[PDB]
Amino acid sequence: PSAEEFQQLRKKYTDAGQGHVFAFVDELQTGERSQLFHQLSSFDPVRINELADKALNPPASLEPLPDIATASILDSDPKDLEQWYEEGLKLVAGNKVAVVLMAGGQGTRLGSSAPKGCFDIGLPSHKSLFQIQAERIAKLQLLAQRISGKEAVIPWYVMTSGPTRKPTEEFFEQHKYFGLNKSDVIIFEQGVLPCISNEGKILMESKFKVAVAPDGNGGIYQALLTSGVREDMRKRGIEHIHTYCVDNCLVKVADPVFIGFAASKQVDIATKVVRKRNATESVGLILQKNGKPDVVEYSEIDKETAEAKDPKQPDVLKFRAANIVNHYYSFKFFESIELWAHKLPHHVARKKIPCIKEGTGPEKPNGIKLEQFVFDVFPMTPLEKFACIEVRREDEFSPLKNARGTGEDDPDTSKRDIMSQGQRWIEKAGGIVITVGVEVSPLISYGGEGLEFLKGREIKAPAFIEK
Numbered sequence: 185p186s187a188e189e190f191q192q193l194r195k196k197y198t199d200a201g202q203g204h205v206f207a208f209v210d211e212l213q214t215g216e217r218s219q220l221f222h223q224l225s226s227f228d229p230v231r232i233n234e235l236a237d238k239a240l241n242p243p244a245s246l247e248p249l250p251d252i253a254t255a256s257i258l259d260s261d262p263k264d265l266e267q268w269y270e271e272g273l274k275l276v277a278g279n280k281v282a283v284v285l286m287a288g289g290q291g292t293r294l295g296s297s298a299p300k301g302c303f304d305i306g307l308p309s310h311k312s313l314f315q316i317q318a319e320r321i322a323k324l325q326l327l328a329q330r331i332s333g334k335e336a337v338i339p340w341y342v343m344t345s346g347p348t349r350k351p352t353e354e355f356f357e358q359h360k361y362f363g364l365n366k367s368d369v370i371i372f373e374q375g376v377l378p379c380i381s382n383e384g385k386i387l388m389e390s391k392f393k394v395a396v397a398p399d400g401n402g403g404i405y406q407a408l409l410t411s412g413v414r415e416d417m418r419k420r421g422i423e424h425i426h427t428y429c430v431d432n433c434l435v436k437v438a439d440p441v442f443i444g445f446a447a448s449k450q451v452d453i454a455t456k457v458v459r460k461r462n463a464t465e466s467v468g469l470i471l472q473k474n475g476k477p478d479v480v481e482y483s484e485i486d487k488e489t490a491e492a493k494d495p496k497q498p499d500v501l502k503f504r505a506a507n508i509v510n511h512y513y514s515f516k517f518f519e520s521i522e523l524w525a526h527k528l529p530h531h532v533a534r535k536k537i538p539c540i541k542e543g544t545g546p547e548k549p550n551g552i553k554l555e556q557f558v559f560d561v562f563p564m565t566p567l568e569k570f571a572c573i574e575v576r577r578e579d580e581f582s583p584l585k586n587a588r589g590t591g592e593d594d595p596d597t598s599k600r601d602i603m604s605q606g607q608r609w610i611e612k613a614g615g616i617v618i619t620v621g622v623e624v625s626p627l628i629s630y631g632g633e634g635l636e637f638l639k640g641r642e643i644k645a646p647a648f649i650e651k
């Protein structure tokens with residue numbers, strides 16, 4: 185980079201009051217100077233000031249969603265469920281369904297060196313989360329081809345962060361994309377934002393590098409633009425998109441009932457909830473805020489509304505629609521990302537951020553991280569174009585939040601929930617499990633179907649059913 189270019193960027197950053205980022209320029213080699221220039225050129229210091237000022241010196245009517253925006257697998261006529269299943273499989277057969285996997289962030293509570301998706305929860309098969317999810321996609325394609333006689337393709341768009349992108353790609357490569365076609369799997373990367381000190385200043389990770397952090401799972405939308413994923417969806421004729429979080433080992437990827445329901449109700453956005461397990465559960469709550477669909481994140485709710493009770497049922501929580509990060513979107517919505525993505529607010533968390541001030545190294549929080557949330561598009565959705573669908577936790581939601589030996593939301597509960605699901609399915613089909621649980625490969629059964637061959641047979645738990 186030329187001296188005139190470098191000087192123009194230094195004036196920009198200095199005039200914006202961020203001139204410290206050049207404080208160690210005189211000590212840098214050419215490579216380190218080149219890095220700093222390119223990194224700093226990717227941010228607008230003035231925009232950073234505006235974000236910092238909103239975050240650091242910042243400036244509601246809550247009810248449960250109305251019954252016209254809600255649904256429940258429990259209250260559902262089994263004929264509707266069967267019809268929605270069939271229409272969902274028809275949409276897969278028409279190559280109209282895509283999956284976006286949010287596999288970014290860090291996964292800091294589990295404390296793994298690898299991307300969370302790689303984690304092996306200890307099933308008999310030792311499949312990772314990624315592989316279980318990939319095989320559900322493959323199975324669903326197989327089921328769809330049974331009705332169409334033609335190839336069925338659910339493209340898998342896998343969003344990672346800067347940190348996790350390279351280990352994610354190597355892993356997929358080493359597993360040959362889990363039997364999927366690499367041309368139908370796109371790994372891409374969310375954006376970053378610089379970390380901001382408590383005094384509003386950009387934090388320097390090193391003498392030549394700014395401390396950045398991923399911009400939240402709400403960064404998914406803009407990243408679909410700049411990565412070309414949205415254009416790939418358009419080329420393929422995608423009309424229905426399922427987005428989910430990688431940490432849930434029970435996730436029904438591209439759930440045909442969910443998608444069939446959303447498409448058939450012609451909603452623009454849909455989302456799955458489970459009954460909140462208690463008042464302190466670390467889950468966003470889905471509700472009606474100032475007349476619109478909305479979510480209150482567990483990190484921003486007050487003890488008041490989290491503890492609020494149903495007027496008629498004094499021991500049930502008034503707000504209990506727990507977000508399980510399972511969203512439906514009509515493709516039409518993604519066509520206007522340019523119009524609304526920059527409207528998504530920036531949520532603030534105080535962080536201890538390793539940085540340099542004459543050498544690297546922070547006891548108490550020295551700055552903040554900014555994040556957009558994926559559910560903050562819900563207030564953009566008309567109530568009659570929104571569906572909040574209750575599902576069964578024990579079939580649909582088993583998150584890996586914590587390291588082993590926590591007690592909940594950890595690898596042991598994940599493994600327990602998967603193998604209880606398998607046993608229950610096998611028992612429904614007439615099999616006898618002896619004994620815990622049974623792992624059922626997604627390639628054998630996506631959601632309980634195709635287990636007739638186990639009828640009358642005895643299975644000694646633990647067991648593993650594959651091809």
Ligand SMILES: CC(=O)N[C@H]1[C@@H](OP(=O)(O)O)O[C@H](CO)[C@@H](O)[C@@H]1O
Binds near residue numbers: 401506
């Ligand atoms: C922005 C976002 O998606 N937050 C989600 C997500 O929380 P995490 O902080 O990422 O663990 O997972 C929860 C389900 O496990 C969900 O209830 C919550 O609202």
Ligand SMILES: N[C@@H](CC(=O)O)c1cccs1
Binds near residue numbers: 532553
């Ligand atoms: N997703 C969480 C994780 C964190 O505390 O870093 C955030 C909330 C608000 C800003 S970041």
Ligand SMILES: CCc1c(C)nn(C)c1N
Binds near residue numbers: 453514516517
């Ligand atoms: C979620 C509803 C929607 C669609 C479709 N397009 N736009 C701009 C909105 N808000």
